[PDB]
Each structure stands twice: as C-alpha cells, then as structure tokens.
Design a protein around this ligand. Sequence first.
Ligand SMILES: [Mg+2]
Lengths: 56, 114, 120, 122, 209
Amino acid sequence: AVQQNKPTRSKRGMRRSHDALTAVTSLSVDKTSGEKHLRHHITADGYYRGRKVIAK
Amino acid sequence: SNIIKQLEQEQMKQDVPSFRPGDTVEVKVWVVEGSKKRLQAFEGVVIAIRNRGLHSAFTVRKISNGEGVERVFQTHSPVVDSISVKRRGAVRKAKLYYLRERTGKAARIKERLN
Amino acid sequence: MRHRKSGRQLNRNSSHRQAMFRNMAGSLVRHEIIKTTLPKAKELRRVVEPLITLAKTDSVANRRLAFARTRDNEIVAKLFNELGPRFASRAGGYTRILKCGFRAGDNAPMAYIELVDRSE
Amino acid sequence: MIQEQTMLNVADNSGARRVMCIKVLGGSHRRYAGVGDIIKITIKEAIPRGKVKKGDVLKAVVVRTKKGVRRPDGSVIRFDGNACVLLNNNSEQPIGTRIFGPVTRELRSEKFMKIISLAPEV
Amino acid sequence: MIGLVGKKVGMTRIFTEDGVSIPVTVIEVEANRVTQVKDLANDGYRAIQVTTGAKKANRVTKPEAGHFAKAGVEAGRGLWEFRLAEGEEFTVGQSISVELFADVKKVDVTGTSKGKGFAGTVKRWNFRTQDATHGNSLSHRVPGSIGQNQTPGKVFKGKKMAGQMGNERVTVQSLDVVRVDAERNLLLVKGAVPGATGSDLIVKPAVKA
RNA sequence: AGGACCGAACCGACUAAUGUUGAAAAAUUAGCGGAUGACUUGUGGCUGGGGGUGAAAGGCCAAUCAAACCGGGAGAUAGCU
RNA sequence: CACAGGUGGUCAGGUAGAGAAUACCAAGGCGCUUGAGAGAACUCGGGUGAAGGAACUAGGCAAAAUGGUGCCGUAACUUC
RNA sequence: AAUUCCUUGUCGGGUAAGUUCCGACCUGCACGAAUGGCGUAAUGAUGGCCAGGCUGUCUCCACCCGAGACUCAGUGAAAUU
RNA sequence: GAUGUCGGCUCAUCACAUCCUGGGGCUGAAGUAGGUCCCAAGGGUAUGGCUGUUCGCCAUUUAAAGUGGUACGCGAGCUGGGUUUAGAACGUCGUGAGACAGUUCGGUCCCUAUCUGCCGUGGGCGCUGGAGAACUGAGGGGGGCUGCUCCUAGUACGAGAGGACCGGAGUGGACGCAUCACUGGUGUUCGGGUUGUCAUGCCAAUGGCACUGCCCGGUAGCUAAAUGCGGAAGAGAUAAGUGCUGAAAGCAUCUAAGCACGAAACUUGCCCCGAGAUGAGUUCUCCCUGACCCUUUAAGGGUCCUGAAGGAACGUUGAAGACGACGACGUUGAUAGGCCGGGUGUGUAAGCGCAGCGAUGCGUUGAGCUAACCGGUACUAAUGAACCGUGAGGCUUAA
Ligand SMILES: [Mg+2]
C-alpha cells in the first residue's frame, strides 16, 4: 500500500524520462495566405488549402 | 462475398413453395433405416421462418400424442424432399412462439383468404 | 469488445444522444455552419445526411418522417423547400468537416461542420 | 440436456409418473444426459398398485428432451418436455410394456430396440 | 511437401446427397509465385520463398521492388517461406497453383487468431468465478489467491493471469479437404480455421495425418 | 369501539450491497417495523457527577461515561520503558 | 467545507388515481462549478438469458416471484 | 429439553442419502411447580425444520446498457519513509 | 513499540512412501479377477444428504476418487459458519459478585501497490555506413488423461461356471485450441404492439417521459449449450526386468571384455515464443561516388553545397488496440462517412377510397421503415509541401 523506503532523485528522474513533450514536427504554410497552420487544420484567418472557408 | 454467393447459389434448390408463418405445412423428409430409404411426413404449423439464402430454415410444430414436437427444417437440405402448404393461416407476427404457451381452442389460427 | 460496431457512445445514454443529435441537426440545417467537437461532427454526418436524402422526394409521408426525426416544422420546411432542390443532383456528401484547433476550456479538438454549398 | 436434480416425466406404463435424475452415468465429472443416455433416477410420484413405488432408486433412459437432438443435415427436434423410460438396474431392459409419445432414432442401438419396437412414432 | 498462402473468404456449408451438411471454410489461394530458392550451400537449408496477390506500385518500396525484379515476378502483398523435403525441386519464378492439393486428404492451417485484447482470467484461462452473493465483496471475477505464504515468497514464472488474448499465430491440424477447385482458385476445408475473414492463411499438408 | 388491520406524511432501524484517507467521526440505495397511541413534535422549565436519569442495555448526562468536563493539589507516584 | 445528512409551522393547480401514494404536467424553479475522448481487465448500479431449477450456501443471503377490484369459496384449532 | 456428558442414545416419520427437525421412550450426568410447572387461540423485522411457486444462488457463465478504470487539458492529496 | 486463528471459496506448486494408466519378478498365477514386491511422478485423480466442520457415516458414481510438504499454502485474494468481547437464557457450582475447554439465540473483517515477484505491452540504445524484408534456431513455454463397445474369438484356458494375452476398428467422458457455417443467447444503435400523461393550434399522425415505461420479435458483432481439430505414430538413449556369447574360477555364471531387447518417465518428433543468442547470427534487395579551410594529426574540428534509400509525423481509419504498438489507405485514391442496388429484420406505413351507427375491417400493399451486412460509387474527408535520416563507411594480419 505504501513505501518502506524513500525512492531517490535518481529513480524519480528515470520514471520521468518518458514525460518529455513532443514538439510539433513541422507547420504547414498556406498556398494563398502564406500563414503557418497545423496540417489539416484551418488558419487563424480562416483559410484552408488556399480557400477562405470561414465567415470571419 | 461473390465467391460464397456463387458457391451457395450452386446448391440452392428451386422448387421451394412460398409459405408464411401460421400456415399449416406438410414436409416429406427422407429417412434411412439400414439400406432402405423412405419418406416420412411431418405435418404442423409454421411458427418461424429464417431467410438466409442457402442457410434458410423454418420451424414446424405439431402436437404428437399429447406432447408438442418442434422440428427446425433446413429448407435447402436434400433430406427434406417436398414441402406443401395445406392451409393458409392469418397472423400478424413473423414468429408465433406464443403457441407454445397456448393449447387447444386458443391455439386455432383463422384461415386466410387474401 | 467493439469488433465491427458502429456509433460512438459519447459518454451519454441513448436518450440524451438522440436528443442532442436532434438539436444539433436542427442547428446545422438552420445555420449551415456550426462549430462543435470533431467526433460529434463525425456522428452529425450520419444524423444529418440521411435527413437531407429524405428531403429529396417531397411527399406528406416524407414530411412526417422528417418531423418525427427532427421535431421542428421550420427545419422540415427548410429541408424540403431549399436543401432538397439544392442537393437534388448530388449523390451523398452533403456536408464537410474542417478541423479548427482546440477548445480553450478543456483542450477538446474542434471542427466546423458545413453544408457543401452554403454561400454565406 | 438432463442433469442431476432435474425432473423427468415417464413415457411408459411402469407406474412412475415423475422421476428425478440423481446421477448422470458415464464418466467422471460428466455434466449432461442427452437423448439415448442412461441416468440413475429416484421415483417421486407413482400410481398406487404399480410395478414400481415411490422412493425407488433405479435406472432410466432419456427418450425426449426440450434441448433436442441435432440431425447430420443440421435440423433440430425439440419436445415440450423431458421424458424417460425406466429400466432394471442389472439388466437395463424396460420395466413397462407400453411406450407413450414419440421417440427419436438416437435410440437406434441394439439395447433400445425394445423401446423402438413399441414406440408409437419413430 | 510445401504448402500455400491464401485468404479466409469465410464460412459456408456443403450439402451432400447423403443428407449431411459439412461446414467448410473457403480459402482463396491464388498463384503463389516463387521469389527465391534457398539452398544448402549459400543459405544453409532448402526453402522456397513465395509471394501472392497484388500490391500498389506506389506502396511497394524500392528494396522490395528490386527483390521482386531479381526473380522477375510481380510484387505481392507479402513473402512467406516453405521448407523443402529433400526430394522436391522448384525454380525461381515458378507459379504454384491450388492443384498442389489435388491429392491431399488432410491439411494444417496456420493463421492469426482474432484479437480479444486485454482479457481477464475467467475468459483467458477458464477460471471459475467466485460467489456472486453470500457476502462476496468486490471479488466476483478476481483470480483469487496467486501463491503460497513466504516459503517461496514469490509468484512463480509462467502463471496464468490476465493479459493479451488472441492476435497470435495459431495452427489447426488435420482438417479434411472437401473440394479443390482449380478454375476458381478455391479450397474448401472442413471446420473453422483461425482468424477473421480476409486474413492470410498458410495451408500445408497434414504432418500427422 | 379498538394500546384493531393495510398504507403515505411523521417516528424508527430488521436484511443486503456500497462506502470505510467516506458525499457523511454512523450515511446512501433497495427492501423493512409503528403509524389515534404506552404516539409523535415545537417553545420554555426542572433533576448535576459517588450525583442525576434509566419500560434496566452499565444505557444516557454536548461526537467523551464501571463514575462527565474545566481549573487546581501537581513537576502525585512510576523498584518500568 | 459552496459537505448526498438534520431543521418547527403555512400554502396545496390539471389528467389518471382511494389517496397529501404514483406517473406525466401548470405556476414557479432548476441541469447539481472540472471537462473532452475511448469504449480493455476488473469494480460498482441495472437489463436479458438456452436446458436444469436451491444441485449454491452455515443458511434460499441476494435476487426472482406475488401483488388491484368484484363475485364465488374458504381448513386444523379457538379465549367464539 | 434454550436443561442429556457418554450422544449423531434407541425406534419410527420425512430424504436416494437427515449430527438438524417431528413423534414416541425414560439410566432426568445435572426438570419441577409464583428465581413458578404444564398447556394454550391470537400476535412476532423472534430460533429450527419441511413443501408449492420462483428464479443467474448454482451447473457455467454469455451478451448488453450506464458510472469509474484508460488517454488528453486544468487543479492537485494521503498514509509511509 | 501486533508474525490475524479453524473450516469453506479462488488459485495452485513441489515430493514420491503410486490412487488410476505403463513396464516388469514372484504367486497358494489353469482362465477372468486378484495379492505382493521392484521401476515409473507424463497426464489424470467424484457429485450429493447430515454437520461450522477437517474427519466421519450414508447415497450414487469413477480408470482412479493417493499420501504428504508448501506460515497444518492461499483474509494488503473472498467469506465469517466455528473459536475468542460487550446482550440474554437453561443445567451446574458458589452466601455473592460471578464462573464453566456445558449448552442457546444475537452479534462492524480497513488499506488508492513504492520495491521484489508475476502476467501483458511499449520507449531508448546497442548489434560498427545506413535502410527494407525473409529467415536459421541457441534457448524457452505449451501438450502428453482415459472409459465402453465390436473383431481376432465363445477361440486359448477351463469338469463346468466362466473366459483372455497380443493385435485391429468404432464410439464416448473430462481437458485444450479455434470459429460463428449451423442450433441458440444477447443484441437500451432495427421494426412493431400497448398503458398513463404532456406536447406539436385541433382531427389524423408523431415525439418526450414513466427501469429501454411494459412487452413481442430481431441484423451485424460477441458468444456456448453450437461444431471442427488435438493428446499420437515414429526414433534415440535407458529404469526395473529378460537374455546371447563368456572368462576370472577347465565347470557354472546377463558381465569382467563384447552383443540384443526393454516403460505414459529422459532427448527428439507435435504446437507457440525465440539473435539483447552482447556468442547481438545468415540470406536477398535498395541507397549515398561535392569542394574547401583548421590545428593538441586524429576513428579531430569547422564553413558552403548537398538531404538519397527509408523513416517519422499528420490525416481517413481496422474483425488491431487500455495508451503505446500493429495492419490498410491519402487523389496514381475504395481508407472512413454518405449515396445507389441488394440482402436481412419487422410484418401490410401514411394519405386516400369503400363497408359498418361505432370500435374496426377490406383495397392500394408483403406495404413502410430498416444499425453494424454484401456489391458498387470519388459526393465529403484523407494536401503542393515541410521534418528526421547523408555525402562510400576504422585498424591488424592473411588469402
Ligand atoms: Mg457485488
């Protein structure tokens, strides 16, 4: 249920070795607007694959 | 499943008479006793029909000497030789399992004239 | 075990699921563009596209089926009067899902669902 | 599909009306007696002044089941009740003379020929 | 003698005139094309590598493309190997058909069984459930005890517990060959065989027979 | 008529599951007993610790009871840890 | 503790109902202050289940089952 | 026997099989007459036994619907050492 | 300054002083059936009534219902009947308070797993230039049970009664793996019936809510009770045992030399895992074939050009899956949804007409609707890109 011995800094770090975050590999550039966006996601201005399909 | 469909329709019978649940039916089935082969008649009420192409079946109930007897025939089996509709019954359900609970005059089915 | 099953439970019972998709289909037919979660849009496809397909042949029976599945006479009217004639030459694919980032409150993936020719 | 503690009707004129299966004979840990399988039974109801009497322990053969038998073409024959035919312990021949109700061809073995001969059907 | 690679089209039945119904698995075996012959000198053992089916010309990679071009055969959906029984001979590029099983009476079928994922002990090992009532506290399908008291002081290796079930190589031995159909490239085999419909199967002659 | 019967409110607490670092220092759900009476309940008052009260279980007397709590004798005493 | 508990009295709509039970509603008021997915083991709360029917177990624990109105009929025993 | 050690006393009933139960017996270790004896209709969330019905209690578990479990974002304990 | 007790359930594991099955010596072994001893631990090895029971008695089985160890295995796995609290009562003892290895009724079982272990599943690096596959197999795990019937044969044996060895065939029980063609279960995502109530202005028709309201059926999937398969044969070396030849010891002797048999035990043969097998293996294919500077000269550092094979990431996803992982697919496209056709299920929709006073019935009509299924179809969504991965790969000796 509970420890008998305090685990160490070392074992803490080894357990945390798989906690690293994977940064975004590469952002896609819009062909019309040239904005950077996540692939298959629309741009902040509302573009996607060169077309402005967003009301705003 | 083109392949399985071809294999099945290679074996599906052709002269299956059209019948519905609630119809009284006579089924002639082959029986082998030793080397001789003979026909035995099973007459009863069609209480269930399963339509699955080659795997089509149907259940027939008859009261044989006080006790009911249900036989689930496989319509495309060579064991079953001929099927004949003796009486057209009028029901509203695809399956008539309530006839198990029913007995006697309550088990009667009105004849159809459509 | 989920072998060959369809439909997402979406952490709701079936009654809540039916009611939610009824409301959401009404909203999509009304506005022609709605922001929702990605899986919700994936299921709204299956809810809304059959309804528009039903809205092709204009008959009283189809009107009553649509009203049974929608419970909004304005939505039924818009379907049979506008979206039937609009999509009458299209074989399915009446809708479009565009992924649009994540929700701030809970990091849920977000998608716009649109009718393929809304012109707004 | 007959287990221990299950009640069976009697399809013969040996006198017993209802019997209870108390051991499924065969091998060890054997679960079920189907049609044509020998069971050990105790008589729970019997007509007065019959060959057998209440409380007797003897052998029987299952001749009808609700679970039914499967035929080689894949058909199933089910019955509205489970019934058996009483047998002597040390000779395995039927106690009674008449057999009531239908039977199946699963009893087509050299030992149950006497049941098949006097059965009214099959 | 060698086997062949096909796919599980599914299950059906064959009615015979005698009045019996035989449940058959339908295995579609197209032409197995030999891609490589292994010999005792170069490779150390006698085997034939074979491929079957088609594969997209863009999804075949250059390594595999060159490997197929070496044998001068079209690229299939995989590569399998069969060991030669010291008397038989095959050449690279040969096409082995279902007629190989013309005289085979019994076969063994190897395939990947359906995957059940993480399976508990009741399903995976036929463990008997504890009492559903009579005071049982949260311990209905639990495995129960898993060892002795402190004399071993450990769980023994190889113990039956919960984990992955299915999705593993399984062979079924001594299955009757019902029908061998050259024109339609089909083999009907009595009984169920491992895997889902549309999955790769390796059919060999029975080793036990 | 009834310390009558079935049964809500209300008063209770027989069984089971849950929960047991609880939602809760005694509860929740499903069932369960009484339910015009020796009933129940609000407001105020009285009985005080070798004392009270007790259809009596050593029960209850502010989550404390084979002798409450607070302060004192008091740094009791401890051949023991 | 923004805590599934406790807290006296008054008001008492419609339909069905003996009813202040119960179901659905009105007035009125709320969705309970983390959510999004997925649809493993196992746990908790439920639904259904072939054949058998207490063989379970310390024990029919728990579940299943019965259940309303009217008429008929109603045993041993009894302080009537 | 809420009382009997030997004791699962003996015989019978009920079960295929009954240390439990019911009835009779009497060698009452160690009943007994207001610390009441022996019966008793009715009452009982009372102990023991048997039967009809019912059933996932069980043979022997299967499938399904929800809440957790698992992953993602936010906040962020505990015993122990 | 706490190592939870008896019995039960779940899960087991070893020993062999063997219960069954195998091999054999003797037998007061004629045969069947036994007894006893020796070898043998591969597999198998009851269900109920009574009782808290372990035992035990009894009933009925089985090839057998083995004996022991494992904290009299197993409560951070379950239970709590028994023992071992507080209430109460009987017998007995005691003046009493009380007491009893007497009996009786009632009577709270906590723990979110850090480490070892174990069952599964991944990330990293390594394996010496990188990458994609296919393997060998060192090593490891699984599995190994058995009944009954018939033939040989009513033969051998036997006064009869009875009645085989060896060999062959079939058919079962328990156990295990796979699977969904069949028989079914389930199927709150499909269809229908019906109760009460609210609602959509009302009729008609539908919807919500009442355990999916209550029910009747039922697709795909999952599944057992369903149906296929399996335990082997064979080989090698042996145990007890049986021998052949054969001296020591002129004979005799299975043993000293030499030779031949011999069991479910051992090693293989059967299935699965398997090169982190750091002893890191083998085979096939693919790919990269540019210039300059620098100095502690080395398997050194740096700038520019180049960035291949492949991978990864992202997306549509799966009979794959807790998450990773694994498989399919991304316009050179059937990967998912939709759509069309079919199929299956339910069982003759609504509207309308006709008959009837009316409930309702008949016709249009086997109608309407129909999840996961089958065959098709680019309608929607799977993007031009970018990202990681380099630029011929050390020394020594030998041919
Ligand atoms: Mg439970």
